[PDB]
C-alpha cells in the first residue's frame, strides 16, 4: 500500500505513510531502550509523549502540530489524511476509479451519423476494443493465438480494420464528458469507425451532454460484460435519453443550427414567388423549388395529411406553407399531432414542445427518427439559406442617437442644483437603467419589420434577428448588449455604474466603457468558475 | 465503494432475483425437512 518503488533516476519514491511508520518505529525503539536503560522519569514520560504524538500524526496528522517530513516541506499525509481528500476512498481510491478500457478524444460534429451512433477514431477503436478484436480474430480464425493477434493489431494491419468494423456493430460505448451534472452525461452510442482521431458526436445529443464542439474531450468507455454491453443499449443509449431527467422537456431538441434551419423554413411572408400555387405531393414542393418557381419563404399551398382524428385521415388540401411542409412530412402520422404544431414560427421553445409532443403522444422510435430527420433537414435548409452574420445583420436603431441625447440632457437638468445619491439614482436608474430598454425595444421593433423591396417582395429577415427569435443563440439581453445600449456595467460591490455608457459592440467602444464592461463581466466569468464549485459541492451532497 | 452490484437499476433487479431465488431455495429446503 505504501510502496518504495525505484523511480527512474535511482531516487526511490517512498509513500507518505512509510515516513510516519518509520518515525513511530523510531519512537518505540527509543522508548524501549529508555525503559530497559532505566532513564530519568521525566525522559521516559517525555519519550512516551513523543511516541504518542508520532502515533497521532501517523493516523490523522491534523490534530497535532502537522509534523512535516524531514526531506520535503509538504504536510505528510496519514491514514486519516488519505481518506479525507480526493486521493483516498473519497475520490481517488473507490469512487473515482481510473477505469481502463477508456478513451479521451476531442469531439467533432457528427451530422452524417444517426442519433444513436457516435464517431469513434480508428486509432482509438483498436486500443479500446483490443480484447474484442482478439476475440473476433480468434473466432473468425484469422489469428492462431492471442500473441499473434496482439502482433497483428499492434502494427495496425489492413486485415484487422475489417474486423474492427465488424466487432463494433451493436457494441455501445459510454460517452463520458469531462463535467457531468446529470445521468445524461454518460450516454452509450453505437460507435462508427470514422476517419481522423476525433469522436464524431451527434449534434442533437451534445446539448444533453453539455458538450459544445469548441474543445470538449468526451471520455469514451467500452462495457466489457455481455450485460454491460447490453445495459448500454437498453438504458444508456442516446435514443432512450431524449427527455432530460430534470423535467418533462426533451433534451434532444436542436440547440443552435437545426433550430435556425427550422425557423428559416417556417418563416412565412405574404410576398414571395408562387403565391397560392397548389401542389400535389410533398415532392412537388421541392420539384418546383428546384425550378425557381416557388421560393422557401413558406407562402404556397399544397397537400399534406395531418392525421388528427382516429384512424387514417384523408389528404386534405391544407392552406399551409411549403417550408412548414418539409418539417411536417418529418412528423410521424398520429392523432393530436401534424401540421398544427408546425403552424407556429418553429422557434427553439416551439421545436422543443414539438419533440415533446411527438414523444408524449407517439413512441420513442418515431421520436428519435423524427429528431434524426429534422436535424438533417434543418442542416440542409440552413446551409442553403445563407444565415451568415454581417455588418448589416445587427442593425443599429436609427432612433438611438436622439434618444441618447435626450437621456443625457435629462441627466443634466436635475444635476445643476445637486442629495447627491438621489440625483445619481435618477441619472443611473431612470436615465440609463431606464430608456436602455427603450432603445433596445426600438431596435427590436426596427429589426422585426420585414423590409419590402421595390418588387413587392421582402428582401430578407436579419440573421441576428432570426437567431434571437428562434432561440438558437440570440436573446433580448444579448441583442441589447450587441446592438442596443449595452446597459450599465456592474461594480465590485454590486452597484451599477453611473457614467454614461452609450455604445454597442457593433460600434467602437472607447477604453473606459470597455474597461467597465470587462469589470462587470469578469465577475460573472468568475461566478462561472467559482459558483460552479458550489454547484459541484451541492450536487455531491445531494447524491450522497 | 465495496465493489458489489449496486442495489439500484439492473443491480436492483438482480438483487430482487437473488432474493426470490433465496426464497425459492428456502421453500425447497422446507420440502425436504
Amino acid at each position: 500500500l505504501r510502496p518504495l518503488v525505484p523511480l527512474d533516476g535511482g531516487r526511490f519514491a517512498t509513500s507518505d505513510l512509510n515516513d510516519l511508520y518509520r518515525r513511530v518505529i523510531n519512537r518505540n525503539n527509543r522508548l524501549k531502550r529508555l525503559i530497559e536503560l532505566r532513564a530519568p522519569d521525566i525522559i521516559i514520560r517525555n519519550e512516551k509523549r513523543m511516541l504518542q504524538e508520532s502515533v497521532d500524526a501517523l493516523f490523522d496528522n491534523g490534530r497535532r502540530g502537522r509534523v512535516i517530513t524531514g526531506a520535503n516541506k509538504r504536510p505528510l499525509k496519514s491514514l486519516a489524511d488519505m481518506l479525507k481528500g480526493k486521493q483516498g476512498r473519497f475520490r481517488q481510491n473507490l469512487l473515482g476509479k481510473r477505469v481502463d478500457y477508456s478513451g479521451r478524444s476531442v469531439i467533432v460534429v457528427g451530422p452524417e451519423l444517426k442519433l444513436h451512433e457516435c464517431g469513434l477514431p480508428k486509432k482509438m477503436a483498436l486500443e479500446l476494443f483490443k480484447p474484442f478484436i482478439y476475440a473476433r480474430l480468434d473466432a473468425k480464425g484469422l489469428s492462431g493465438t492471442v500473441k499473434q493477434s496482439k502482433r497483428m493489431v499492434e502494427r495496425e494491419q489492413p486485415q484487422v480494420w475489417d474486423i474492427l468494423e465488424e466487432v463494433i456493430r451493436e457494441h455501445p460505448v459510454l460517452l463520458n464528458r469531462a463535467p457531468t451534472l446529470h445521468r445524461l452525461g454518460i450516454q452509450a452510442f453505437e460507435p462508427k469507425l470514422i476517419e481522423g482521431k476525433a469522436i464524431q458526436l451527434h449534434p442533437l445529443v451534445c446539448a444533453a451532454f453539455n458538450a459544445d464542439f469548441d474543445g470538449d474531450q468526451m471520455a469514451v468507455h467500452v462495457p466489457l460484460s455481455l450485460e454491460a454491453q447490453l445495459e448500454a443499449r437498453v438504458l444508456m443509449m442516446s435514443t432512450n435519453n431524449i427527455l432530460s431527467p430534470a423535467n418533462g422537456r426533451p433534451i434532444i431538441v436542436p440547440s443552435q443550427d437545426i433550430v435556425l434551419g427550422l425557423y428559416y423554413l417556417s418563416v412565412a411572408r405574404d410576398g414571395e414567388p408562387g403565391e397560392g400555387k397548389i401542389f400535389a405531393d410533398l415532392g412537388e414542393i421541392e420539384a418546383a423549388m428546384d425550378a425557381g418557381v416557388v421560393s422557401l419563404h413558406a407562402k404556397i399551398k399544397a397537400r399534406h395529411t395531418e392525421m388528427t382524428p382516429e384512424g387514417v385521415l384523408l389528404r386534405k388540401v391544407i392552406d399551409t406553407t411549403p417550408g412548414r411542409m418539409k418539417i411536417a412530412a418529418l412528423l410521424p402520422h398520429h392523432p393530436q399531432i401534424g401540421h398544427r404544431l408546425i403552424e407556429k414560427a418553429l422557434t427553439k421553445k416551439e421545436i422543443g414542445n414539438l419533440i415533446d409532443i411527438v414523444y408524449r403522444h407517439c413512441g420513442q422510435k418515431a421520436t428519435v427518427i423524427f429528431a434524426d430527420k429534422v436535424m438533417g433537414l434543418g442542416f440542409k435548409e440552413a446551409a442553403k439559406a445563407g444565415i451568415s452574420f454581417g455588418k448589416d445583420d445587427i442593425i443599429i436603431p436609427v432612433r438611438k442617437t436622439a434618444i441618447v441625447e435626450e437621456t443625457r440632457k435629462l441627466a443634466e437638468e436635475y444635476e445643476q442644483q445637486y442629495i447627491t445619491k438621489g440625483e445619481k439614482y435618477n441619472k443611473v436608474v431612470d436615465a440609463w437603467a431606464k430608456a436602455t430598454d427603450r432603445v433596445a425595444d426600438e431596435m427590436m421593433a426596427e429589426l422585426q419589420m420585414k423590409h419590402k423591396d421595390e418588387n413587392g417582395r421582402e428582401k430578407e429577415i436579419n440573421a441576428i434577428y432570426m437567431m434571437a427569435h428562434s432561440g438558437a443563440r440570440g436573446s433580448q439581453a444579448q441583442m441589447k448588449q450587441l446592438g442596443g445600449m449595452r446597459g450599465l456595467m456592474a461594480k465590485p460591490s454590486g452597484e451599477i455604474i453611473e457614467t454614461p455608457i452609450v455604445s454597442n459592440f457593433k460600434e467602437g467602444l472607447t477604453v473606459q466603457e470597455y474597461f467597465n464592461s470587462t469589470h462587470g463581466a469578469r465577475k460573472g466569468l468568475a461566478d462561472t468558475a467559482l459558483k460552479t464549485a458550489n454547484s459541484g459541492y451541492l450536487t455531491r451532497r445531494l447524491v450522497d | 465503494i465495496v465493489g458489489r452490484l449496486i442495489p439500484a437499476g439492473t443491480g436492483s433487479y438482480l438483487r430482487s432475483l437473488q432474493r426470490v431465488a433465496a426464497k425459492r431455495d428456502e421453500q425447497l429446503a422446507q420440502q425436504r425437512e
Binding site: 463535467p179 451534472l181 446529470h182 445521468r183 432512450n240 435519453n241 431524449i242 427527455l243 432530460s244 431527467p245 430534470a246 423535467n247 418533462g248 414523444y359 408524449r360 420513442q364 461566478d527 462561472t528 459558483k531 460552479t532 458550489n534 454547484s535 459541484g536 451541492l538 450536487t539 445531494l542 447524491v543 | 449496486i6 439500484a8 437499476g9 439492473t10 443491480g11 436492483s12 433487479y13 430482487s16
Partner: peptide
C-alpha cells in the same frame, strides 16, 4: 423523467433528483 412511462422499480430516484438539482448549477446566482 426519462420518458413518458411511469417510474419503474430499481431506478436511483434520489440520484436522478440530485443530478436534476445540480444541473441548474454553474449558471445560478
Amino acid at each position: 423523467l426519462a420518458r413518458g412511462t411511469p417510474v419503474n422499480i430499481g431506478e436511483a430516484v434520489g440520484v436522478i433528483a440530485a443530478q436534476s438539482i445540480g444541473e441548474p448549477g454553474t449558471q445560478l446566482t
